[PDB]
Write a protein that binds this ligand. Structure first.
Ligand SMILES: CCCCCCCCCCCCCCCCCC(=O)OC[C@H](COP(=O)([O-])OCC(O)COP(=O)([O-])OC[C@@H](COC(=O)CCCCCCCCCCCCCCCCC)OC(=O)CCCCCCCCCCCCCCCCC)OC(=O)CCCCCCCCCCCCCCCCC
Ligand code: BCL
Ligand code: BCL
Ligand code: BCL
Ligand SMILES: CC[C@H]1c2cc3[nH]c4c(c3C)C(=O)[C@H](C(=O)OC)c4c3nc(cc4[nH]c(cc(n2)[C@@H]1C)c(C(C)=O)c4C)[C@@H](C)[C@@H]3CCC(=O)OC/C=C(\C)CCC[C@H](C)CCC[C@H](C)CCCC(C)C
Ligand SMILES: CC[C@H]1c2cc3[nH]c4c(c3C)C(=O)[C@H](C(=O)OC)c4c3nc(cc4[nH]c(cc(n2)[C@@H]1C)c(C(C)=O)c4C)[C@@H](C)[C@@H]3CCC(=O)OC/C=C(\C)CCC[C@H](C)CCC[C@H](C)CCCC(C)C
Ligand SMILES: COC1=C(OC)C(=O)C(C/C=C(\C)CC/C=C(\C)CC/C=C(\C)CC/C=C(\C)CC/C=C(\C)CC/C=C(\C)CC/C=C(\C)CC/C=C(\C)CC/C=C(\C)CCC=C(C)C)=C(C)C1=O
Ligand SMILES: COC1=C(OC)C(=O)C(C/C=C(\C)CC/C=C(\C)CC/C=C(\C)CC/C=C(\C)CC/C=C(\C)CC/C=C(\C)CC/C=C(\C)CC/C=C(\C)CC/C=C(\C)CCC=C(C)C)=C(C)C1=O
Ligand SMILES: CCCCCCCCCCCCCCCC(=O)OC[C@H](COP(=O)(O)OC[C@H](O)CO)OC(=O)CCCCCCC[C@H](Br)[C@@H](Br)CCCCCCCC
Ligand SMILES: CCCCCCCCCCCC[N+](C)(C)[O-]
Ligand SMILES: CCCCCCCCCCCC[N+](C)(C)[O-]
Ligand SMILES: [Cl-]
Lengths: 281, 302, 241
């Protein structure tokens, strides 16, 4: 079925691979060569998870868990029941995500729009690959990757964090958190602002972007503007994920001790290092 | 490369924009500030004007007093030595009164009282600033969505600092003012409550925090992707749908099988964000008042 | 248990909220249609919301949504298959007919107004006190298409007054008439403005504006559509670079 205004845009073209061969829709969904690729990788992934369920002996989705090769395996392959499936499901996952980004590129080409979305998405994929591929490879084993389970991956988060003390003290992690909170601040403000203009006090006319600038100037002395705010949300959210990837890629590799202790470089700068008093003298 | 519209290629400037008047009391608006060519590559170059009536002066003043109350305590912790102040700045902490003082104000200045003064000033700064988000909207005839949204953030803050401490019977349960000390507090809060990963409201809050990043990445990327058809002019696209709004919908429809409108994506947005601190506030409020241990709770409640 | 009661209530609330949000997002484009533009049989489990009305400023009317959806323009496309879900081929020139990525919507044929009722976008020459403040000034630069041939010269920037930003370049053609190019589709370089989307032979076909010191919402859509359409439809003439 189509949106009222949709037919004019469903023209041939924009595919990256295979010409017209997969240039069609199923309901609302665009297919394309990367739709077929995503489906293949997803499907195989889900079947393999389902088989892992069988070998763990559960079907409960709060219990199903696919764990990577134990550290003894290094960067080699492992048997299906003992780490192998995870390795294959990770390949399938990566294939499905990257296929999803490339399908998005095909949809952009057909619609004549910029590629900002798949580009954005590629940061999420990079965060994922940091955790399951780059970080394991640099650390020397697939076992450092997180297991695929609803709760077990939370276990991995907590265990991984506490290996380095209170993970709060990872400085890249502080920057990452800051971007996440600031992004949520900006999302609230942005939604609220456009809606406050689109939905003014009862009986009144819609307000103008000029009212939106004025509101923020009256409130904080500055307005970033309608273009700026969309640039900002994109930057905050991508910066959040960039610093997330960063804060993990450095951990277990360039830094592996208690993160609290990293901060001593500052306290031991030689001018103030030996001055008595304060907390650290 | 295609131009991507992350930074502007050419900046233009005109007469300073002094803003809409509606019912605003113009006596209380500053003149315009300077223009920043640097900000201008990314957003608006113009700084100011700002509105500052009596509620604004109160909030600013009270906010500054909060900041000086902590500052003076830190300088004292530093033995009045600026070398030591910079060195140990992240280690200083203004701590609430000991458990023994309950909810009283009887604690010595050096051992609780200054924390109470600081919290007093912060309470006044935030609430008056809240009133200012409502009133500035009112003066322009706009809806009150910002003040409602801001109230969700105030909720989490009110819970950590005031409501939960009151319900537990002591100011000692509130958060210290300090960079490292408040992180330590956060860690300790989770340990002592059986691991906050087992709090369903904490899981929700994460879902929304991550989701806010998902959503603003999607939405910002989208508006930028259709900026070649005027997409960022959202109010007018609301009032008179254009090919920007249609291509944006259809990108998402073709990708994930459903889509938004130009007004409605802003409703997904306000809620995704606001639910971070709403659910987060519930989760903290219930911790130690009703549930001492989330792992335990979990074992008895799915 | 009060936590159990809280979490169970929250899920009920979130389900209601998602329902409400989805219905709000069906104020445009619904009911869903068949490829022939009649109402589809399956609309989904979400109903259309109750209509809302926006009172538009400057005597410009209201907008009530949802309402009767109509393209209000002919769509030069035809089916390429005997069943649902395949592309629809342009029946003439998709750039002139405005289909595919060259599509435009039939927005109001008036200009967007600002807070004070003045045209939001004006040529900089007509915008009191506006000037280029930083960046390469493009006025006077030759404009190059993706066939690497000169299509014309920049004669002004059209600026958004209330937002103080460049929105179009006004480009003069061989015959002395001008066209608007979206600023998002040009690359201002030290010695030229490069336009990847269009080869030089396609510039004359950019939709013109009926008054030279203002653009209407409808005209913006035709220009922006046409220019974006070139990424697909001028690809044969698009040299490597
Ligand atoms: C325990 C778990 C409990 C779960 C509940 C969680 C809490 C929910 C809070 C509800 C807030 C509702 C506000 C509202 O109705 O907005 C009107 C709004 C109209 O907005 P508009 O048309 O844009 O504004 C028109 C004008 O400008 C005129 O409007 P305006 O300019 O005045 O502003 C309109 C609107 C605009 O803003 C928004 O819509 C975003 C809302 C953010 C609200 C955050 C509230 C903060 C709460 C902090 C305290 C937390 C305590 C938690 C405990 O905000 C308001 O309506 C006023 C809010 C006042 C709240 C005061 C709280 C005092 C304490 O329509 C809605 O947004 C409706 C929301 C949909 C609710 C879903 C209901 C689901 C029902 C479940 C049952 C289903 C069964 C399924 C099986
Ligand atoms: C005890 C726990 C430690 C701790 C240990 C860790 C560890 C360990 C990690 C973090 C990481 C993060 N922590 Mg920390 N952290 C702690 C305390 C906190 C606090 C807090 C308030 O105290 C906060 C706010 C944060 C915040 C954060 C973020 C900066 C970052 C998580 C987001 C991320 O990486 O996204 C990136 C996004 C993704 C990975 C999503 C990828 C999605 C993919 C591409 C798509 C999937 C599709 C899906 C399968 C689709 C299904 C089908 C459809 C739904 C239909 N931490 C405590 C002190 N933290 C993580 C990080 O930085 O990772 C890089 C990390 O590994
Ligand atoms: C990012 C840093 C850590 C991490 C830290 C945490 C912490 C801490 C928490 C979660 C939580 C969640 N995480 Mg995790 N999580 C990580 C990596 C992932 C990946 C991945 C492929 O990289 C996925 C798919 C998930 C998925 C999830 C969800 C089960 C849950 C809600 C997230 C959410 O709403 O996000 C935002 C996205 C949306 C709102 C869009 C919808 C996404 C839906 C919900 C995803 C469904 C996933 C599905 C169950 C997975 C299987 C796919 C099928 C086989 C097809 N996480 C890495 C290891 N995650 C929370 C939880 O409650 O866990 C129980 C929680 O507290
Ligand atoms: C070891 C640490 C514990 C833990 C302990 C806690 C605790 C304790 C809390 C959280 C909370 C949260 N944690 Mg946790 N958390 C852990 C692990 C994680 C991980 C992870 C990947 O491991 C993640 C992603 C998170 C993520 C999250 C968030 C979803 C949530 C906070 C939301 C927010 O916006 O707050 C930030 C927003 C605010 C604080 C609102 C503030 C608003 C006020 C009004 C602003 C005043 C401004 C002031 C005047 C200064 C102004 C200066 C200006 C420039 C003028 N946690 C581990 C398990 N987490 C919070 C929560 O809700 O939990 C349920 C909370 O209390
Ligand atoms: C970079 C900034 C943020 C971001 C951006 C972003 N995400 C995106 C996009 C963008 C721009 C899209 O365009 C794309 C989209 O379509 O969204 C609707 C997407 C997307 N982000 C998604 C999720 C998601 N994003 C997240 C994060 C973020 N996304 C960042 C915070 C997170 C987390 C945990 O925070 C999640 C869970 C999906 C909704 C969607 C991508 C859908 C997709 O790739 O579909 C194809 C794959 C399948 C249908 C299933 C694959 C099945 C696998 C083969 C098996 C499962 C393996 C998996 C590793 C198991 C995990 C178990 C868990 C319990 C841990
Ligand atoms: C809904 C969830 C999210 C959220 C929402 C939210 N926050 C909000 C709002 C909303 C909707 C507002 O409307 C309000 C706002 O005004 O935003 C602009 C606010 C706000 N959120 C704020 C902060 C904040 N929000 C946060 C979080 C969140 N906010 C959540 C993630 C966080 C954290 C910890 O994550 C912080 C720190 C403030 C920016 C603003 C509330 C302002 C306030 O209450 O101020 C009172 C205090 C003062 C007035 C003291 C000010 C002192 C000045 C800095 C003096 C300047 C003088 C001079 C310039 C000095 C020279 C030196 C300088 C260079 C330093
Ligand atoms: C209709 O449209 C709209 C507009 O237009 C009309 C608008 O104007 C607005 C209004 C918008 C604004 C006025 C702009 C608002 C600006 C913000 C919300 C935030 C901007 C912030 C940044 C760009 C970056 C600053 C934020 C962070 C998180 C920076 C990183 C943090 C740190 C470095 C500090 C923490 C780390 C520490 C201490 C560790 C130290 C590390 C080492 C030593 C290493 C809205 C909402 C809108 O909708
Ligand atoms: C102003 O502009 C904008 C719009 O429009 C005007 C928009 O809509 C959006 C989009 C945003 C929304 C609709 C808001 C709601 C979105 C969220 C809260 C984000 C999270 C989204 C989800 C969790 C849904 C995820 C669903 C997915 C990923 C799809 C699942 C897919 C399938 C079941 C089928 C997959 C199809 C394939 C593989 C292709 C081939 C299919 C065959 C069958 C073959 C944005 C950002 C926007 O800014
Ligand atoms: C959100 C929490 C913090 C918010 C930030 C608040 C920052 C406070 C800024 C301090 C402003 C000081 C104002 C002094 C004004 C003054 O002395 O007189 C104004 C004087 C003359 O005015 P006039 O004679 O016209 O007086 C009024 C007249 O009678 C009626 O028209 O002119 C000026 O001084 C102008 C000064 C420029 C003001 C611009 C301030 C810009 C602020 Br700092 C912006 Br850059 C802050 C951005 C913060 C954004 C934070 C959001 C976080 C997400
Ligand atoms: C008890 C309620 C207060 C909420 C917690 C506030 C802690 C934030 C840390 C502020 C640090 C002090 N200072 C001056 C360095 O910013
Ligand atoms: C936050 C989780 C994602 C929300 C999912 C909302 C479901 C969308 C319903 C799609 C219905 C599409 N339809 C048939 C109306 O076109
Ligand atoms: Cl500057």
């Amino acid at each position: 079925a189509l949106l009222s205004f949709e037919r004019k845009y469903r023209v041939p073209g924009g595919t990256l691979v295979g010409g017209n061969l997969f240039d069609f829709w199923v309901g609302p969904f665009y297919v394309g060569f990367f739709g077929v690729a995503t489906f293949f990788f997803a499907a195989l992934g889900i079947i393999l998870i389902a088989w892992s369920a069988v070998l763990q002996g559960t079907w409960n989705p709060q219990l199903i868990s696919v764990y990577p090769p134990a550290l003894e395996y290094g960067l080699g392959g492992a048997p299906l029941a003992k780490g192998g499936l995870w390795q294959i499901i990770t390949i399938c996952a990566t294939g499905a995500f990257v296929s999803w980004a490339l399908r998005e590129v095909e949809i952009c080409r057909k619609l004549g729009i910029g590629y900002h979305i798949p580009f954005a998405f590629a940061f999420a994929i990079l965060a994922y690959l940091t955790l399951v591929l780059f970080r394991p490879v640099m650390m020397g084993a697939w076992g450092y990757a997180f297991p695929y389970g609803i709760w077990t991956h939370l276990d991995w988060v907590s265990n991984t964090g506490y290996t380095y003390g209170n993970f709060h003290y990872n400085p890249a992690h502080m920057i990452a958190i800051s971007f996440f909170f600031t992004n949520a601040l900006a999302l609230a403000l942005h939604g609220a602002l456009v809606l406050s203009a689109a939905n003014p006090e009862k009986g009144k006319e819609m307000r103008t972007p000029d009212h939106e600038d004025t509101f923020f100037r009256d409130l904080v002395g500055y307005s970033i503007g309608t273009l700026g705010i969309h640039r900002l949300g994109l930057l905050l959210s991508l910066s959040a994920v960039f610093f997330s990837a960063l804060c993990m890629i450095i951990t277990g590799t360039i830094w592996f001790d208690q993160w609290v202790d990293w901060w001593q470089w500052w306290v031991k700068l030689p001018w103030w290092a030996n001055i008595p008093g304060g907390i650290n003298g | 490369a295609e131009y991507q519209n992350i930074f502007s290629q050419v900046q233009v400037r005109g007469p300073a924009d002094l803003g809409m008047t509606e019912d605003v009391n113009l006596a209380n608006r500053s003149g315009v500030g300077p223009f920043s060519t640097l900000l201008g590559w990314f957003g608006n170059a113009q700084l100011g004007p700002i509105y500052l009536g009596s509620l604004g002066v109160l909030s600013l003043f009270s906010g500054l007093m909060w900041f000086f109350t902590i500052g003076i305590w830190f300088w004292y912790q530093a033995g009045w030595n600026p070398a030591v102040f910079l060195r140990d700045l992240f280690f200083f902490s203004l701590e609430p009164p000991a458990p023994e003082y309950g909810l009283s104000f009887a604690a010595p200045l050096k051992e609780g009282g200054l924390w109470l003064i600081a919290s007093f000033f912060m309470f006044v700064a935030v609430w008056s600033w809240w009133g200012r988000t409502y009133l500035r909207a009112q003066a322009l005839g706009m809806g009150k969505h910002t003040a409602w949204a801001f109230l969700s953030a105030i909720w989490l803050w009110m819970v950590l600092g005031f409501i939960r401490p009151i319900l537990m019977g002591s100011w000692s349960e509130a958060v210290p003012y300090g960079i490292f000390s408040h992180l330590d507090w956060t860690n300790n809060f989770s340990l002592v409550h059986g691991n906050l990963f087992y709090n369903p409201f904490h899981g929700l809050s994460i879902a929304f925090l991550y989701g806010s990043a998902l959503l603003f990445a999607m939405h910002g990327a989208t508006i930028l992707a259709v900026s070649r058809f005027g997409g960022e002019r959202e109010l007018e696209q609301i009032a008179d749908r254009g090919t920007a709004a249609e291509r944006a919908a259809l990108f998402w429809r073709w990708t994930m099988g459903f889509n938004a409108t130009m007004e409605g994506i802003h409703r997904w947005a306000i809620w995704m964000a606001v639910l971070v601190t709403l659910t987060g506030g519930i989760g903290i409020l219930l911790s130690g008042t009703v549930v001492d241990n989330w792992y335990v709770w979990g074992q008895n409640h799915g | 248990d009060l936590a159990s009661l809280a979490i169970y209530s929250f899920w009920i609330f979130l389900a209601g909220l998602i329902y409400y949000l989805q219905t709000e997002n069906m104020r445009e484009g619904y009911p869903l249609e068949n490829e022939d533009g009649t109402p589809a049989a399956n609309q989904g489990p979400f109903p259309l919301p109750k209509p809302k009305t926006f009172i538009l400023p400057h005597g410009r009317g209201t907008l009530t949504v949802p309402g009767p959806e109509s393209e209000d323009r002919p769509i030069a496309l035809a089916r390429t298959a005997v069943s649902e879900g395949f592309p629809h081929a342009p029946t003439g020139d998709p750039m002139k007919d405005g289909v595919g990525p060259a599509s435009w919507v039939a927005r109001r044929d008036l200009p967007e107004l600002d807070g004070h009722g003045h045209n939001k976008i004006k040529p900089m020459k007509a915008a009191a006190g506006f000037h280029v403040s930083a960046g390469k000034n493009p006025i006077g630069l030759p404009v190059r298409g993706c066939d690497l041939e000169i299509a014309g010269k920049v004669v002004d920037i059209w600026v958004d007054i209330p937002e103080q930003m460049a929105r179009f370049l006004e480009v003069e053609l061989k015959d002395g008439s001008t066209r608007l190019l979206p600023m998002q589709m040009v690359k201002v370089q030290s010695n030229r403005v490069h336009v990847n989307a269009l080869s030089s032979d396609l510039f004359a076909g950019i939709p013109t504006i009926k008054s030279p010191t203002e653009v209407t919402l409808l005209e913006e859509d035709k220009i922006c559509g046409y220019v974006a359409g070139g990424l697909m439809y001028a690809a044969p003439k698009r040299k490597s670079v």
